[PDB]
Amino acid sequence: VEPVVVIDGKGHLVGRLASVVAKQLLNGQKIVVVRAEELNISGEFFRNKLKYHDFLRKATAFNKTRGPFHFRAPSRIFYKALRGMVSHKTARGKAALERLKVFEGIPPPYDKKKRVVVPQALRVLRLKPGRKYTTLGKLSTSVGWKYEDVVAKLEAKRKVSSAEYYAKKRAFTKKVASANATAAESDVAKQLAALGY
Amino acid sequence: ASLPHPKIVKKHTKKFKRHHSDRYHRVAENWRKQKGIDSVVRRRFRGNISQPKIGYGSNKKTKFLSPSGHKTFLVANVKDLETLTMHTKTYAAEIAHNISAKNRVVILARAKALGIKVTNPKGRLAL
């Protein structure tokens, strides 16, 4: 329904988000994944760290420079997770991975555009309450991502920049809803409502 | 034109080229069955060339028929073309390659006189 969608990565499980995103990428959809810091992996944090180290110590023996490039940024973690879910080697897979753009935090111009969430990939709707979870923000800092603090400050600034945006949007929405009430209970709206709206 | 005929369909238009005929130059394009004990072309593996079979045999009612709906006929002399006087709807004339230019003009003149379509009328045109 949408030309390009911006997926908020907050509160999503890595695998269940990545699967639906990989399907939508192949179907010809354009998706930009933001807030990859808060992307969640189900289960114990230390277990996830050990799993990552299992992967991490696994490199081309004769020349480490060409082995599996163990990316540390949360965006590249999620993007590697989405690879493998896409036949990346072929040209169609290459096109899909071109149609994918993963971003730490919310860079412009996706900062001023509507973000979307995948309801059935969510931690809230997929993890039974009580089962603890692992978040890429701390996992990546534990594995080598050396930019959490600056990402933290940039998001601190983006929260206030968007907070004033909503502060004025709420006021305008309130005044337009109040004007809707003012112009309501007239014939044009009264019989429109019974007409269906 | 010819008599009405069923719709033409080859059922295999692509030629059946011999295996490895491009990988090697000595292997001619003419089809030869791969008769080896290892050969995946003989064992009919998926994703390999399909050998000619009788199942590809064209419809009998449309065999030897050109798209124009005629059976070809090598005509060499005018007397040969006099054979197809009343069978213009079945056999189409065709000048043999070794017919000289001066002898092709007379044959095409008799061809239009007899009303037989010729499938190489622009051959060895004298100009």
Binding site: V117, Q120, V124 | -
Partner: protein, 172 residues
């Protein structure tokens, strides 16, 4: 095959000139249809009496429907099974609405807990608990409390589209 029906299967030895009219045994079988009813009848009858389907005959197969199929009632199900390293018997309380649903839930829960398939479960007896104050399982006595009340926190709503524009809540 878990969608069940109770059938009463009545059957007997082949009548003979020496002894006619055999005793005409009968039992209540939980089965997906009449064919599995016949099969389970002969199985549970071989394990009881010297008779085989070749040497016997089935006189009737009547579906049994509940007297109050929409009334909650507690069931004590004596059930035996064959575990990996021997057999067992036990007695499971179930709180369902019909004997059919009780045995359905029972096979499903036995396969879930003790990993016992149908081929290794024999329902000895499903007796409706006539009154309370005798069920010995806390997981049923907790639903026999007065003013049985409990909420349902964290409702998950199934979605229709891959994309939702509201960050769904979960109140309920």
């Amino acid at each position: 095959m878990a969608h069940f029906k109770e059938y009463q299967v009545i059957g007997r030895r082949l009548p003979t000139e020496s002894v006619p009219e055999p005793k005409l045994f009968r039992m209540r079988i939980f089965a997906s249809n009449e064919v599995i009813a016949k099969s389970r009848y002969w199985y549970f009858l071989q394990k009881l009496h010297k008779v085989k389907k070749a040497s016997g005959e089935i006189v009737s197969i009547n579906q049994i429907n509940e007297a109050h199929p929409t009334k909650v009632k507690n069931f004590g199900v004596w059930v035996r099974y064959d575990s990996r390293s021997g057999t067992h018997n036990m007695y499971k309380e179930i709180r369902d609405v019909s004997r059919v649903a009780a045995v359905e839930t029972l096979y499903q829960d036995m396969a879930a807990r003790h990993r016992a398939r149908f081929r290794s479960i024999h329902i000895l007896k499903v007796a409706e608990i006539e009154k309370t104050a005798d069920v010995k399982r806390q997981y049923v006595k907790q639903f026999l409390t007065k003013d049985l009340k409990f909420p349902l926190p964290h409702r998950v709503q199934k979605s229709t589209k891959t994309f939702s524009y509201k960050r769904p809540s979960t109140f309920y």
